[PDB]
Amino acid sequence: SMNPPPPETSNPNKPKRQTNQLQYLLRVVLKTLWKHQFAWPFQQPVDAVKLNLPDYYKIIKTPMDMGTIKKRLENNYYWNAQECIQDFNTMFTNCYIYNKPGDDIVLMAEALEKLFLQKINELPTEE
């Protein structure tokens, strides 16, 4: 069995910014979700080999996870906050697409998403 290459976290020719919204996405949003008791399934790319999910990457073609997001934020990969918000939403959506309603991992995603939405609701104004 085989995993795909992970999403890109480094690309020297991608233009980059460090903005107050992106700082909030790291300091408040990522940190809040990362420390949660339900974070662990989402802290790294889905390992379809270890988890015995041979169809995962047949179904999920835009993988995303908080390990990748953390690396992107720490390495100033983004130009804007919308790119990062999209990554979180991709992560949640993948979970809901692949799994069955009411599965433990879906409940976990929902709890993290609730917090995500509460924090993004107060995304600061651009400086």
92: its two tokens = 């949640």
| Measured distance CA(31)–CA(40) in Å, rounded | 13
| Measured distance CA(15)–CA(77) in Å, rounded | 8
Q: Is residue 62 part of a domain?
A: yes
Q: Is 83 helix (H, G, I), strand (E, B) or coil?
A: helix
| Measured distance CA(69)–CA(64) in Å, rounded | 8
Only one residue has tokens 């651009």, namely 126
Q: How many domains does the chain have?
A: 1
Give the technique used to solve this structure: X-ray
CA 12 vs CA 26, 35, 78, 79: distances in Å: 20, 30, 11, 13
**Which domain, by its residues, includes 82?**
19-123
Q: Is residue 6 part of a domain?
A: no
C-beta of residue 10 within 8 angstroms of C-beta of residue 78: no
| Measured distance CA(58)–CA(9) in Å, rounded | 22
CA angle 27, 32, 38 (to 5 degrees): 150
Q: Is residue 10 part of a domain?
A: no
